[PDB]
Design a protein around this nucleic acid. Structure first.
Ligand code: GTP
Ligand code: ZN
Length: 635
RNA sequence: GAUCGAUCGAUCGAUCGAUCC
């Protein structure tokens, strides 16, 4: 039921101006949006109709908003619908927009329509409600819609422009250090959304924090393990592996010049990636031994990266989980190739496993971080035996490691697997939320806490400055509410004018396409895949090959997670068709009725014909060549 | 295919996670 708390938030928006209203709850925002929609559709006299649009960022929240708006708007006779990726396939979105009032289509669909030509002007709507409007920062679909709105407004042909009332929970600080930078960031966010009012609770503070999270911070600084026997063995393995890898690459220490790297860190992973990308561009004129050298170097770098990931897992999660990860990687990589390099690496890993398994089964090598985690979990479940806990981790490789640790450790039997009846839920990013644990990560049931287990004071300082940023953001919101609506309007107008100017400035013209007929080669094999003359672009995003020689140059493999995205339908993945390469080259899809193995320029190296330099790109946008459109009349 | 956030490294690059088409 609409109470005074919702009316205080909805009042500054019913006048007819955009707002940056922010509520710490979700049901409050939903109810406020409902009342705003009602007051906007009921204020229009006879002869006019409303076209309020709601922008949901995710599919679950989209379905929730669609259900709520369909259940609420049943006695008013309003056409409420919604479009998504599984709905805008061969459907007249223009007829849906023109024959409905409360459409809840996604922002990406509206951006694609504005780019294609459908819905030319943004003045057809009369009310825009951007859910979670704090994402309007850079290159966002919300930001693209706002750029279109500003281009239509400041361009001099602004017609019946709709309201741009937003809806978020936290305004956000970003990277602000002092109050002035926070105020500048908030003003830039408000000008990007083109709003002069920031509605928030200022009078009804009595009933605000009744259903508010209100968390508690319980930072616990822990130290790492000292008995790094497993780490020592893995470091010796990586050391002799890098030593025997320099037999073919004498300049391996000069390909990446950053600093002295240590095993078990992210800097070592970056060094591995850099030396891999630097050795993948070898130009030996033999073209037969170069392939073997590149394959051996790729195998060496992949094994080193897997060892580094195992070291990171053993440092963060348990040791047996890292050993199981290594064994699983070696089992999955053994059935692929049987060459001398892989056989030597596998036999060395098997020789070291006889001691690795003995070190892993030693009960005196338990991580103290997991020890204090188990201790605090036990004390929290002894305080209350009905706590639904959530455990955030950095990398997904720990979501199963901690799950196996919970299932195996006998000191905690009240827990249940919660990989994302379920007691603890081990996830990575985002119910009851009775307790949150940030294990090296940087709601309801009032009385919840938030533990921060970390072996570094850097995360503690980051959380402290984040709390300070939240406080100064609240202060800046208060200061902006103190200001008037006129000077704020002039300020946001100047800010958005400068934004439009700098945006029109950074407009790179069409680059000269490389008329040469360069070719593409595999990453870990350096085999001739296809020339650029046989590469056809479909919709300025996807690239495919239609040659007949390339059709037998790959092998198919069943896709573990197939899904269609508005243009194709997945069928399988494509891999390199060589002796023991099995490298990912792309994915097999169907556009309308044919079958196309669309490849990615990331897993390829570009070699010229005239010069011969082996270039390496990451995205198709960086590859500047003659992009011939895919014509279905050929094949 | 694009976007976002975090970490790291030389205005850019790598990894991770999430989102959409
Ligand atoms: O070039 C990309 C891209 O064209 C295509 N692709 C795969 N999924 C999508 C999608 O959801 N939406 C769009 N627009 N394009 C998609 O795959 C090419 C790259 O192949 P990848 O193996 O890297 O991607 P894939 O989905 O096959 O596997 P993964 O990256 O998720 O692990
Ligand atoms: Zn290959």
């Amino acid at each position: 039921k609409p109470r005074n708390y919702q009316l205080e938030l909805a009042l500054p928006a019913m006048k007819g101006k955009n707002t940056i209203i922010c509520a710490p709850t979700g049901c409050g925002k939903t109810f406020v949006s409902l009342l705003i929609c009602e007051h906007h559709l009921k204020k229009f006299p006879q002869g006019q109709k409303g076209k309020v649009v709601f922008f949901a960022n995710q599919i679950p929240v989209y379905e929730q908003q669609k259900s709520v708006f369909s259940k609420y708007f049943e006695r008013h006779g309003y056409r409420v619908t919604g479009i998504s990726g599984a709905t805008a396939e061969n459907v007249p979105v223009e007829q849906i927009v023109e024959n409905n009032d409360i459409i809840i289509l996604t922002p990406q669909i509206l951006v694609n329509n504005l780019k294609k030509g459908t819905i030319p002007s943004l003045s057809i709507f009369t009310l825009m409600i951007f859910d979670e409007c704090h994402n309007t920062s850079k290159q966002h679909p919300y930001n693209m819609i706002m750029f279109n709105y500003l281009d239509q407004k400041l361009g001099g042909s602004s017609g019946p422009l709709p309201q741009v009332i937003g809806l978020t929970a936290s305004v956000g600080v970003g990277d602000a250090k002092n109050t002035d930078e926070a105020l500048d960031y908030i003003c830039k966010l408000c000008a990007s959304l083109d709003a002069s009012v920031i509605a928030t609770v200022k009078h009804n503070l009595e009933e605000l924090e009744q259903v508010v999270y209100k968390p508690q911070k319980f930072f616990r600084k822990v130290e790492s393990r000292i008995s790094d026997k497993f780490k020592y063995i893995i470091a010796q393995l990586m050391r002799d592996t890098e030593s025997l890898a320099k037999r073919i690459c004498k300049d391996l220490e000069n390909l990446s010049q950053i600093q002295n790297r240590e095993f078990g860190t992210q800097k070592y992973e970056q060094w591995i990636v850099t030396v891999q990308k630097a050795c993948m561009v070898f130009q030996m004129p033999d073209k037969d031994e170069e392939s073997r050298i590149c394959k051996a170097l790729f195998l060496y770098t992949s094994h080193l990266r897997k060892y580094n990931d195992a070291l990171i897992i053993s440092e963060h999660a348990r040791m047996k989980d890292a050993l199981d990860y290594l064994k699983d990687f070696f089992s999955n990589v053994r059935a692929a190739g049987f060459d001398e390099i892989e056989q030597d690496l596998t036999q060395r890993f098997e020789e070291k496993l006889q001691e690795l398994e003995s070190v892993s089964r030693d009960p005196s090598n338990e991580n103290p971080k997991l020890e204090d985690l188990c201790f605090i979990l036990q004390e929290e479940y002894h305080l209350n035996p009905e706590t639904i806990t959530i455990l955030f981790v950095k990398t997904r490789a720990l979501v199963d490691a901690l799950k196996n640790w919970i299932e195996g450790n006998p000191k905690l039997s009240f827990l249940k697997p919660g990989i994302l009846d379920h007691n603890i839920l081990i996830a990575t990013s985002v119910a009851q939320c009775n307790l949150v644990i940030l294990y090296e990560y940087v709601g309801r049931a009032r009385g919840s806490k938030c533990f921060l287990l970390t072996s570094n004071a850097g995360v503690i300082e980051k959380e402290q400055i984040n709390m300070y940023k939240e406080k100064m953001m609240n202060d800046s919101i208060l200061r902006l509410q103190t200001w008037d609506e006129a000077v704020f309007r002039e300020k946001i107008l100047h800010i958005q004018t400068h934004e439009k100017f700098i945006r029109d400035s950074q407009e790179k013209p069409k680059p000269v396409p490389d008329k040469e007929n360069k070719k593409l080669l595999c990453r870990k094999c350096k085999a001739l895949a296809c020339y650029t003359a046989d590469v056809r672009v479909i919709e300025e995003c996807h690239y495919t090959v239609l040659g007949d020689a390339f059709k037998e140059c790959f092998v198919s493999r069943p896709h573990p997670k197939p899904k269609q995205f508005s243009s194709f339908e997945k069928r399988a993945k494509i891999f390199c068709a060589r002796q023991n390469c099995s490298h990912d080259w792309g994915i097999h899809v169907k556009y309308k009725t044919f079958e196309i193995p669309v490849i990615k320029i990331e897993s390829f190296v570009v070699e010229d014909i005239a010069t011969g330099v082996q270039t390496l790109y990451s995205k198709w946008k960086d590859f500047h060549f003659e992009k011939i459109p895919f014509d279905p009349a050929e094949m």
